[PDB]
Amino acid sequence: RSSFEKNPIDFLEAKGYKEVKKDLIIKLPKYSLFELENGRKRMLASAGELQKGNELALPSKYVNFLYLASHYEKLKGSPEDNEQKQLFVEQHKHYLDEIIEQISEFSKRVILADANLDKVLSAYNKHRDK
RNA sequence: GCGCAUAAAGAUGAGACGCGUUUUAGAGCUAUGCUGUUUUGAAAAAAACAGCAUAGCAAGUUAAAAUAAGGCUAGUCCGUUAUCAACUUGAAAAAGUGGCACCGAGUCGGUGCUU
DNA sequence: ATGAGACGCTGGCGATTAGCTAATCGCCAGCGTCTCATCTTTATGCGCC
RNA sequence: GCGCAUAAAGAUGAGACGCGUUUUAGAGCUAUGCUGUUUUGAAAAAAACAGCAUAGCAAGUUAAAAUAAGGCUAGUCCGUUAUCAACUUGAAAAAGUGGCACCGAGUCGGUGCUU
DNA sequence: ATGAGACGCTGGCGATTAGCTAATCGCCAGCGTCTCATCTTTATGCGCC
């Protein structure tokens, strides 16, 4: 860094370059944000690696459902509303497959999760009875 | 809202010790086979000269170098950590820089004024 | 007081000849101590404009 | 500007003949070695059963298929050549379609009107 | 008339693992005949509104 920031053009000429655009030398730190297609963003992880730059904007319903269904805080209160929420978990079992759809579209749109996603789907079908 | 007791914790900075790493020196060897071979020559053969391969062995502990590359500020000093968005000035420091009434809301889209 | 102007197998093969990133995954990451002091800060415990 | 003589040339269309190509049939062979092997078996070994390799040989002439793929129009017919710029209609045929006074001239650039 | 809120080595290697046009040049191209007729056209040679 010190040797490059001192004489940049001389360093590039020493590296093995000819006819170097002096005004086209961009300093790119880590996590430099870039965007390509369908809102798919990628962050510059290095000079030879990138990072995922998109979040799946999921509605509040699925979030609260996951909280109550996964049993995150033992949901203590008055037993009545706890049992109704338990019933609400047993009823909205389609939220599972809806989440699977959400992950599939978001992963096929940004992640490019292909074979890995197939392994995930196979595991979900194998464990759909759980 | 301090002066305070008990029991903890953190942080800072020095001073030093165990290795370790990688190199070199650990003068490791034996036999067999191979070719090139000064080779005895006109060739053959090595003393395999040169290496190669096959097996079989044998010891094995430690010593030295440096230890961010390096730097100059030549000190027995410094150099791995805080401290970096884009942007225009400004040497740097530092400054400035992107509107808003309203409707929707998929990585946002418009909209009045209107950049 | 006559003597120039008029120019091919190539394309479609093989078969040389030559040469290059990329996608997948695994591995594996210098670390050991002590001394010395130094300051903080926290848990609890006590006071009215 | 024809009727004409000499010497040439071209073009057209039929009718047929020589091959050729590539396949198959030219029943080619011998010995040796190899493995799998029903194998005599519990294995061995082939009769190498199966192929393989090494060498050595031997003949060798011709016969048949089709000959643009094919097509239908089933004829004993057709199919390699003229005949194709872009473009809009129009089935096709066929039609229409892109300016120009002026200055320069690198595969052209402008320009008045102005497409 | 108490019992939740605070969630990892990854990047940088090797080393698999996988896979693909392109640039250069050479070769080598179905061909043999005849018959039959058929028309043209050319060189030269001959004539005035």
CA distance A53 to A37: 12
- Residues near A31 by beta carbon (within 8 Å), at least 6 away in sequence: A43, A44, A45, A51
Is residue A62 a contact partner of residue A99, using CB atoms and an 8 Å limit?
yes
Elucidated via: cryo-EM
Q: Give me the residues near strand E, CB below 7 A.
A: A 45-49, 72-74, 76
Q: Which residues pair with A34 in a beta bridge?
A: A42
The pair of structure tokens assigned to A37 is 């297609």
- In this complex, the answer to whether residue A106 has its CB under 7 A from any atom of chain B, a nucleic strand, is yes
- In this complex, the answer to whether residue A124 has its CB under 7 A from any atom of chain B, a nucleic strand, is no
Closest-approach nucleotide to residue A72, Cα vs C1': E4
Residue A92, classed as helix, strand or coil, is coil
As a rounded value in angstroms, the CA-to-C1' distance for A83 and D13 is 104
Is residue A65 a contact partner of residue A58, using CB atoms and an 8 Å limit?
no
- Integer distance in angstroms from the first to the last C-alpha of chain A? 55
As a rounded value in angstroms, the CA-to-C1' distance for A88 and B32 is 86
CA distance A31 to A59: 27
Q: Which of residues 61-100 of A touch strand B (CB under 7 A)?
A: none
The Cα-based distances of A16 to A4, A11, A27 in angstroms read 14, 9, 19
The Cα-based distances of A126 to A2, A33, A71 in angstroms read 56, 38, 22
CA distance A54 to A37: 12
DSSP letter string, A23-78: GG-----TTEEEE-STT-EEEE-SSS-EEE-------HHHHHHHHHHHTSSTT-S-
In angstroms, what is the resolution?
A: 5.3
Closest-approach nucleotide to residue A110, Cα vs C1': B107
